[PDB]
């Protein structure tokens, strides 16, 4: 909850003062081309303005979906990694190298493209991707494009 910057269904003072500030808009409406200009990112939690804003639903939904995907990838990776440790502890046969390695590699690689795309969009700020065009890029099975 401290990470989510929500306390008893209400925001509060983050470690920073205000992550996003209304670009100009001394009297202009929030829905504008200038919108809100962010001085810096609030480190303690999510931006306090985002929680109560009209745009709360899309940004929060995208962040939650990305976090869920990343957490699932991490949990699956940990579970697959535990297989080698279990095989070594019980001194299992060559079946680990025979089957556990491809089993832990195939799913890892399959989710790796999506995880790396999510990270790059988060890292590089590739707004030309967003939540949707990432799936769109993952959608095409064929080459080219």
């Amino acid at each position: 909850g401290l990470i989510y910057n929500e306390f008893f269904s209400v925001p509060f003072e983050i470690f920073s003062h205000s992550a996003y500030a209304c670009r100009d808009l001394s009297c202009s409406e929030a829905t504008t081309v200038g919108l809100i200009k962010v001085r810096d990112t609030y480190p303690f939690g999510v931006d306090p303005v985002w929680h109560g804003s009209r745009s709360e639903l899309p940004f929060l939904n995208s962040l939650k979906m990305k976090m869920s995907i990343l957490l699932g990838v991490a949990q699956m990776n940990l579970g697959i990694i535990l297989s080698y440790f279990n095989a070594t502890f019980f001194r299992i046969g060559v079946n680990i190298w025979c089957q556990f390695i491809p089993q832990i590699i195939f799913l890892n690689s399959l989710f790796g493209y999506l995880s790396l795309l999510i990270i790059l969009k988060w890292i590089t700020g590739s707004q030309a991707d967003l939540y949707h065009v990432m799936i769109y890029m993952f959608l095409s099975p064929t080459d080219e494009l």
Binding site: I3, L35, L63
Partner: peptide, 20 residues
Amino acid sequence: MMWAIVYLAQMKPLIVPILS
């Protein structure tokens, strides 16, 4: 990891927040 996700999401937002 949770903090990293929460910070990378709001580091450079693609969509700005409009207020009701």
